[PDB]
Amino acid sequence: NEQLAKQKGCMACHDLKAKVGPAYADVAKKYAGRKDAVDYLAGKIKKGGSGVWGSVPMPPQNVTDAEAKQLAQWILSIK
Amino acid sequence: NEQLAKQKGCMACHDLKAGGGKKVGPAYADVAKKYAGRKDAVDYLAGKIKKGGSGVWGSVPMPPQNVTDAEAKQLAQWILSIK
Numbered sequence A: 001n002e003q004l005a006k007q008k009g010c011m012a013c014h015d016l017k018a019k020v021g022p023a024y025a026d027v028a029k030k031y032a033g034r035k036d037a038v039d040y041l042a043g044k045i046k047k048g049g050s051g052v053w054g055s056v057p058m059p060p061q062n063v064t065d066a067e068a069k070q071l072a073q074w075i076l077s078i079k
Numbered sequence B: 001n002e003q004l005a006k007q008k009g010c011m012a013c014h015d016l017k018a019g020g021g022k023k024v025g026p027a028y029a030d031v032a033k034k035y036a037g038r039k040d041a042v043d044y045l046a047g048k049i050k051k052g053g054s055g056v057w058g059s060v061p062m063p064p065q066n067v068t069d070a071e072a073k074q075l076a077q078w079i080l081s082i083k
């Protein structure tokens, strides 16, 4: 349940409904028909992994050309 | 600068340094390392900052989790029930 998921840190990366990982409602939809969904998901919860789910993209941002340049220059200075 | 990045919501998805695992975007230190010394780094990154995109940094991994078999199955069963 949510209380267990919260205790174990899961909710830092997952929401119940549509964070970095897939929302649980979407995981449920994807694996609804899969006979061994519980065994499969239990293994994936314990082991982790990558690339099963498409990544969250970067949206366009509310910045002027000059702000974008300032931000690029600032990021390049983190070294 | 950093304050402008905070103002514009950038830190919702980016940390300065890697290790958190919880942010959707790459750490700024890793962006800086990738593009350092590229002649058009500023103009290239400025464009990406304004427009966004996807595909350059790939997946964010899920780390392994210290849960028992029973806990993992309990969580899986619960997750499958979410509407």
Ligand code: HEC
Binding pocket: A005, A008, A009, A010, A011, A012, A013, A014, A020, A021, A022, A027, A041, A044, A045, A049, A050, A051, A052, A053, A054, B020, B021, B022, B059, B060, B061, B062, B063, B065, B067, B075, B079
């Ligand atoms: C706490 C024990 C949990 C539990 C129960 C789950 N997670 Fe994660 N998770 C994260 C990311 C980026 C992904 C995508 C991985 C990929 O695309 O391959 C996932 C994935 C899952 C799933 C789906 C697995 C599948 O094969 O479909 C499930 C059921 C799941 N998680 C449950 C990110 C994170 C975290 C970021 C640091 C952490 C913490 C968790 N997840 C923790 C948990």
Ligand code: HEC
Binding pocket: A056, A057, A058, A059, A061, A062, A063, A071, A075, B005, B008, B009, B010, B011, B012, B013, B014, B024, B025, B026, B031, B045, B048, B049, B053, B054, B055, B056, B057, B058
């Ligand atoms: C606020 C204005 C910012 C700024 C300055 C940056 N971002 Fe993001 N970002 C996000 C994701 C998922 C990625 C990876 C995209 C991919 O894989 O292609 C990025 C990427 C970047 C970069 C690197 C671009 C490159 O071509 O290498 C840079 C410089 C960058 N960002 C700066 C996710 C997010 C967000 C999620 C909702 C938000 C908000 C931001 N980023 C905001 C900003």
